[PDB]
Design an enzyme around this catalytic site. Structure first.
Site, mmCIF file in Angstrom:
data_model
loop_
_atom_site.group_PDB
_atom_site.id
_atom_site.type_symbol
_atom_site.label_atom_id
_atom_site.label_comp_id
_atom_site.label_asym_id
_atom_site.label_seq_id
_atom_site.Cartn_x
_atom_site.Cartn_y
_atom_site.Cartn_z
ATOM 1 N N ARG A 270 0.635 -1.342 -0.025
ATOM 2 C CA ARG A 270 -0.023 0.126 -0.146
ATOM 3 C C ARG A 270 0.581 0.618 0.241
ATOM 4 O O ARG A 270 0.395 2.294 0.002
ATOM 5 C CB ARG A 270 -1.132 -0.133 0.888
ATOM 6 C CG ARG A 270 -0.541 0.396 2.937
ATOM 7 C CD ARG A 270 -0.898 -0.136 3.375
ATOM 8 N NE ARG A 270 -0.025 0.244 4.352
ATOM 9 C CZ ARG A 270 0.194 0.014 5.797
ATOM 10 N NH1 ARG A 270 -0.709 -1.214 6.744
ATOM 11 N NH2 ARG A 270 1.268 -0.200 6.654
ATOM 12 N N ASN A 271 2.395 1.283 0.373
ATOM 13 C CA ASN A 271 3.064 2.361 0.079
ATOM 14 C C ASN A 271 3.841 1.881 -1.150
ATOM 15 O O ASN A 271 4.753 2.990 -1.338
ATOM 16 C CB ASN A 271 4.270 2.537 1.325
ATOM 17 C CG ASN A 271 2.825 2.682 2.731
ATOM 18 O OD1 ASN A 271 1.658 3.336 2.377
ATOM 19 N ND2 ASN A 271 3.222 2.285 4.019
ATOM 20 N N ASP B 122 5.900 6.795 0.557
ATOM 21 C CA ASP B 122 5.697 7.557 1.870
ATOM 22 C C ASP B 122 6.930 7.344 2.761
ATOM 23 O O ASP B 122 7.207 6.298 3.626
ATOM 24 C CB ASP B 122 4.116 6.450 2.367
ATOM 25 C CG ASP B 122 3.539 6.897 3.379
ATOM 26 O OD1 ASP B 122 2.546 6.938 3.684
ATOM 27 O OD2 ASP B 122 4.493 6.959 4.677
#
Ligand SMILES: [Cl-]
Length: 283
Positions: free
Chosen positions: A143-144, A157
């Site tokens: 997700r990052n 991120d």
């Protein structure tokens, strides 16, 4: 201070195309950056919301001075910042397909082993470079990871990114730990190293090959810590090559010194890409 690593961009050079999200420090936007002599460059623009605290400014711009230190095709590139006017901006490259976990969920079973190993090779290449640069990410998860229109994957991120201290090579926390992605010694002792990033990377491997399954599914955070501590590891995803799954297990060694180095990961993955056994098509 952010100017030592980030170029100040004249505000007139940025036009905002659309708002595509909200981060912690305000909106995230798709926009256009016009540099002299060339086409408008599509960019991602993080804006600092009006009425921010001065602490929030430091921490927002904090990520930009981390980003500006890196120059690598599998790390999100910083175009620069706007600080001389309002709103305060951070301008990065645009990644067409957004987050990796989301992207793979929409495309369940759509990629070859070579395509997916390719994504993982890119991620490990950026991590290698990060490692070399004296940084630990701490927040490495699908997700990052961002993915572009060529399926190139980039580490993103750097809110939790910290510079490694000079010791027999770690950062110790002061606690926004993502548990199911985190190495046990980092959970227990709060000691973060390139080797805890490799543990996280093993998790990413498993997410990628699973097409964005949540690691450990509905297991609670306590369930996971106890399980991993006991010796349990996530099982092999469907259609996962044995040697890939074994590389995952290697990342998930309890003793961090036994995990492979990122450079070792990159080499192993290059070997798979170059092995015709893993190519479903030979014509
Ligand atoms: Cl196999």
């Amino acid at each position: 201070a952010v100017h030592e690593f980030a170029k100040e961009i004249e505000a007139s050079c940025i036009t905002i195309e659309r708002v595509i999200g909200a981060g912690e420090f305000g909106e995230v936007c798709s926009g256009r950056l016009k540099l002299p002599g060339k086409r408008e460059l599509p960019v991602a623009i993080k804006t600092l919301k009006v009425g921010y605290t001065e602490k929030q400014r430091r921490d927002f711009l904090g990520e930009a001075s981390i980003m500006g230190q890196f120059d690598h095709p599998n790390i999100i590139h910083l175009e620069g910042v706007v600080t001389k006017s309002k709103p305060v901006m951070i301008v990065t490259e645009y990644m067409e397909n957004g987050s990796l976990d989301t992207f793979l969920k929409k495309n369940d079973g759509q990629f070859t082993v070579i395509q997916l190993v390719g994504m993982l090779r890119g991620i490990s290449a950026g991590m290698k470079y990060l490692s070399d640069m004296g940084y630990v990410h701490r927040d490495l998860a699908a997700r990052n990871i961002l993915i572009n229109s060529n399926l190139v994957c980039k580490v993103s991120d750097f809110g939790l990114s910290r510079v490694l201290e000079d010791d027999p090579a770690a950062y110790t926390t002061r606690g926004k730990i993502p548990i199911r992605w985190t190495a046990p010694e980092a959970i227990a002792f709060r000691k973060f190293t390139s080797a805890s990033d490799v543990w996280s990377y093993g998790i990413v491997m498993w997410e990628v090959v699973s097409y964005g399954e949540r690691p450990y599914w509905e297991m609670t955070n306590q369930d996971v810590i106890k399980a991993v501590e006991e010796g349990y590891r996530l099982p092999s995803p469907m259609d996962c090559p044995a040697a890939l799954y074994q590389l995952m297990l290697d990342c998930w060694q309890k003793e961090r010194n036994s995990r492979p180095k990122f450079d070792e990961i990159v080499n192993m993955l290059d070997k798979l890409i170059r092995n015709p056994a893993h190519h479903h098509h030979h014509h």
